[PDB]
Amino acid sequence: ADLEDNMETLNDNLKVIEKADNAAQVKDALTKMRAAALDAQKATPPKLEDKSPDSPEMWHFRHGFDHLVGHIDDALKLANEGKVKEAQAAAEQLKCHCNHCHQHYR
Amino acid sequence: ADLEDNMETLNDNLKVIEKADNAAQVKDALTKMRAAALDAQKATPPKLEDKSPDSPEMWHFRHGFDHLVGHIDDALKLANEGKVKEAQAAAEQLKCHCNHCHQHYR
Ligand code: HEC
Ligand code: HEC
């Protein structure tokens, strides 16, 4: 998988969670999102290839993935409690993370 | 001013930007929000009253204000460049910062 594949996995699984109505469905989708975010988390993206690894811009980009993963983890815990609607609300709140990183990068 | 005061300032001024009758109200509201966020960063939220100031919880709470201030500063720069519509568009995205911190700590 590459960055584009991981991003499509995140995109589609948000909608799977929206469409779902049970905890198993939400858990499975969040687990796939976690794997995609972890797969994309470590690579320096093309626009930052020439920046220092500890540069502010690279730091903020890496933290975007770290924080996204943290909130996926929190949503997964809600699904594992059987709290379907709370997990779905947490998943919808992930969109803020998506848009924030995209707005910085583009 | 206390944390409740700071949050009222943030709420009122975010809505001012959305409803701004003229462009100059946007910069004025962003300026007040910036100060409210830096004041709030010096408070302890009720749900974290029993936690160490070095807890992961207090660290993430304080950091949320630094990140909010960074995006307020980006919007202020747009306003100061005369790009007030772009600044108003940027201000609407600030709601993600409010929602993220609230889901943890409000
Ligand atoms: C940075 C820390 C990111 C986070 C968090 C998320 N995405 Fe992303 N996304 C990122 C990059 C570097 C790119 C490629 C360059 C570009 O500007 O497109 C993308 C791209 C996408 C795409 C494809 C283009 C598009 O239609 O927007 C999608 C569909 C996408 N990203 C989805 C997505 C979602 C749903 C996220 C949150 C769950 C998300 N991304 C987080 C960088 C980052
Ligand atoms: C953490 C980093 C926060 C950010 C960013 C924002 N808010 Fe907040 N808010 C936070 C806490 C911990 C609390 C609870 C305070 C309490 O004493 O109970 C709040 C509360 C509010 C409220 C309600 C205030 C009240 O009198 O009960 C409002 C209206 C509010 N917050 C608004 C608000 C807005 C609009 C923000 C973004 C611009 C925002 N807050 C950011 C913590 C944090």
Ligand SMILES: [Co+2]
């Ligand atoms: Co968080």
Ligand SMILES: [Co+2]
């Ligand atoms: Co940012």
